[PDB]
Write a protein that binds this ligand. Structure first.
Ligand SMILES: CO[C@@H]1O[C@H](CO)[C@H](O)[C@H](OCc2ccc3ccc(C(=O)O)cc3n2)[C@H]1O
Ligand SMILES: [Cl-]
Length: 150
């Protein structure tokens, strides 16, 4: 069911998601963390506005300092909510990954390299998400979608 919208995108990458993130939709991101990365993020956005900054329904932000972590949050009207921090991170500098974001009715469920990583409850209805941004120090081989409407 997987339709990649792009291979080997230049980062930063911002792309329109070509259908609605209905429950059962998968977002699949394959890539590699450079040796010098401090952080990168996958943002599921309401639009692509830079000024002012588009709302981010789902900010998925691996951080590499110390023992590393993943920060998840929501940006509404240019303000970050309560940080959801996962200390058990599968990401490492100079290692490849596959991220699978599963869009469920009430939350995202994220697996990396085929291992469950975290949950994140919807704070913005996922129907308002139309854009995917990838920012920071990360190399991306592919971004695709398996839409539950197909
Ligand atoms: C703790 O401080 C804030 O925490 C936010 C999540 O709670 C976010 O992770 C904030 O980062 C927002 C942000 C937003 C847009 C970005 C675009 C590019 C880059 C970059 O890493 O070069 C980084 C960018 N970082 C971070 O500054
Ligand atoms: Cl759910």
């Amino acid at each position: 069911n997987l339709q990649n919208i792009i291979y080997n995108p230049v980062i930063p990458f911002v792309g329109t998601i070509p259908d609605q993130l209905d429950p059962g939709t998968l977002i699949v991101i394959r890539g590699h963390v450079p040796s010098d990365a401090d952080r990168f993020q996958v943002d599921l956005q309401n639009g692509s506005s830079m000024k002012p900054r588009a709302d981010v329904a789902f900010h998925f932000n691996p951080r590499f300092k110390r023992a590393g972590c993943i920060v998840c949050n929501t940006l509404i009207n240019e303000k970050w909510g309560r940080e959801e921090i996962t200390y058990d991170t599968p990401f490492k500098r100079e290692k490849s990954f596959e991220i699978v974001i599963m869009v469920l009715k009430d939350k995202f469920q994220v697996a990396v390299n085929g291992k469950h990583t975290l949950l994140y409850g919807h704070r913005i209805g996922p129907e308002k998400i139309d854009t995917l941004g990838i920012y920071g120090k990360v190399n991306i081989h592919s971004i695709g979608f398996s839409f539950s409407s197909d």
